[PDB]
C-alpha cells in the first residue's frame, strides 16, 4: 500500500482536526479560512461544459456531486498563539459570556445528571465593565502572532438526533492582528453564514474521518477505515439557502424544488438550512461531520478558473430507484389513486 498513510489506526475522534492552514497576507481583508458542516448526501448534475481545448467544449456533461449540510456556524470564542522555538503555544483563549445549550453539552459526557454549571463563574467574571476580559483581549492583541476563531455548529437545525455540537478552531487570513481580535469582538454570540466563507467556482479541501469498516484480514491484517483523511481540490458547484425555496432550480430547469430528494436522503433527513454542493465525493459517510478548508494556496488551472453553469439537479429517489423529481410529477404521471378518490 501507501506507506505515508501510516500508522493505519483508528482516529482520535470523528471530528478530525485540520492539520495545516492557508498561509497569510497582511493586507487582505478579514475572512474565515475553514468552515464545517455535516456531510450527508450525494446526487447527479448535468451541465454544459465551457472548458476550451477539451473534447467536450460546448457539450453537456453528467457528473456526481455531494451535498454537505452546513448550518450557519456560530462564533463563541477566539484563541491567540505565540510563535515559539517549540512551535506554537496558546497563551490565552477568550469565550462569549453566554453560550448555547449545545456547547455546554459538549463540555460533558453525561448531560442529564449534571447541574449544568459550566461557565457560571466565567459569566460572573464578565459581570462588570469588562476590566478582565479587555485585559485578556489586550493580552492577545499585544502578543500572539496568529489568531484562531472558536466556533460551533448548529446541531438542532440539522435533522441529526445528536443534540451535541462540535467545537472547532479556525484561523484568520485577514492582516493586522488587531483586526483579527476585533473582528472576533464584533462576533461574540453572533453567527457566520456559509456564503460569507465560500462561493461558486471555488476549490476546497474537505477533511473527514473515513468510513469505518472495522477489523480486516507487507499487506498486513488489522484495522480498515476510520482514518482521518484530507482530500484536496473539490470544486464548489452551489452554495444554497434554507429560507429560499427553488434551490433545486437551475437557470434551465427552473421548477420550484429543494435539492432534497423525495423522502429525503438515505439514513439522513432533508435539508432545512444552508448547504454546499461540492463536486465528486468527500471522504466519510452520511451523518458525518466534515471540515472544509480552502485550497492552502493559489491553485488556479482551468479546472479552478472556469464558471459552472448548472443545468439540472437530480432530486429523484435515492432510496429505491429514481423516476420522479417532485411528488407533483409522481401523481401527475400516475393519475389519481385509491385513497385519493
Amino acid at each position: 500500500g501507501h506507506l505515508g498513510f501510516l500508522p493505519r489506526k483508528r482516529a482520535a475522534s470523528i471530528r478530525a482536526r485540520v492539520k495545516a492552514f492557508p498561509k497569510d497576507d497582511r493586507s487582505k481583508p478579514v475572512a474565515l479560512t475553514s468552515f464545517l458542516g455535516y456531510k450527508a448526501g450525494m446526487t447527479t448534475i448535468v451541465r454544459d461544459l465551457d472548458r476550451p481545448g477539451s473534447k467536450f467544449h460546448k457539450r453537456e456533461v453528467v457528473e456526481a456531486v455531494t451535498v454537505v449540510d452546513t448550518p450557519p456556524v456560530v462564533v463563541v470564542g477566539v484563541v491567540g498563539y505565540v510563535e515559539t522555538p517549540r512551535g506554537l503555544r496558546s497563551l490565552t483563549t477568550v469565550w462569549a459570556e453566554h453560550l448555547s445549550d449545545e456547547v455546554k453539552r459538549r463540555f460533558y459526557k453525561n448531560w442529564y445528571k449534571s447541574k449544568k454549571k459550566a461557565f457560571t463563574k466565567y459569566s460572573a467574571k464578565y459581570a462588570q465593565d469588562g476590566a478582565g476580559i479587555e485585559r485578556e483581549l489586550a493580552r492577545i492583541k499585544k502578543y500572539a502572532s496568529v489568531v484562531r476563531v472558536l466556533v460551533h455548529t448548529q446541531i438542532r437545525k440539522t435533522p441529526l438526533a445528536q443534540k451535541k455540537a462540535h467545537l472547532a478552531e479556525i484561523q484568520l487570513n485577514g492582516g493586522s492582528i488587531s483586526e483579527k481580535v476585533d473582528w472576533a469582538r464584533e462576533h461574540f454570540e453572533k453567527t457566520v453564514a456559509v456564503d460569507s466563507v465560500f462561493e461558486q467556482n471555488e476549490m476546497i479541501d474537505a477533511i473527514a474521518v473515513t468510513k469505518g469498516h472495522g477489523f480486516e484480514g507487507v499487506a498486513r491484517a488489522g484495522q480498515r477505515g476510520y482514518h482521518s483523511r484530507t482530500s484536496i481540490n473539490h470544486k464548489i458547484y452551489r452554495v444554497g439557502k434554507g429560507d429560499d425555496e427553488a434551490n433545486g432550480a437551475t437557470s434551465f430547469d427552473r421548477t420550484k424544488k429543494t435539492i432534497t430528494p423525495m423522502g429525503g436522503f438515505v439514513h439522513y433527513g432533508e435539508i432545512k438550512n444552508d448547504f454546499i454542493m461540492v463536486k465528486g465525493c468527500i471522504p466519510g459517510n452520511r451523518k458525518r461531520i466534515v471540515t472544509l478548508r480552502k485550497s492552502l494556496y493559489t491553485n488556479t488551472s482551468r479546472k479552478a478558473l472556469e464558471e459552472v453553469s448548472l443545468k439540472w439537479i437530480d432530486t429523484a429517489s435515492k432510496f429505491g430507484k429514481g423516476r420522479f423529481q417532485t411528488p407533483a410529477e409522481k401523481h401527475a404521471f400516475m393519475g389519481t389513486l385509491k385513497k385519493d378518490l
Binding site: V30, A31, A193, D195, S196, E199, N201, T298, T300, L305
Partner: protein
C-alpha cells in the same frame, strides 16, 4: 515526463500566478469578505428587532 517537482514547471506556474490566476482569487476574496460584512448588518437589524 516532467515530475510534479520539476523546477521549470514550478517556475512556469509562478509566471502564471503573478498574472490572471491570482487576480481572480483576489476579486473572489473581496466578494466573500463583502458578504461577510453584509452578514453583520442583518444580525444587527435582528438586534434592533428585539431593541424595538
Amino acid at each position: 515526463a516532467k515530475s510534479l517537482r520539476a523546477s521549470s514547471h514550478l517556475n512556469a506556474k509562478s509566471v502564471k500566478r503573478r498574472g490572471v490566476f491570482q487576480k481572480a482569487v483576489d476579486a473572489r476574496e473581496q466578494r466573500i469578505s463583502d458578504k461577510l460584512k453584509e452578514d453583520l448588518l442583518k444580525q444587527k437589524l435582528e438586534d434592533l428587532k428585539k431593541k424595538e
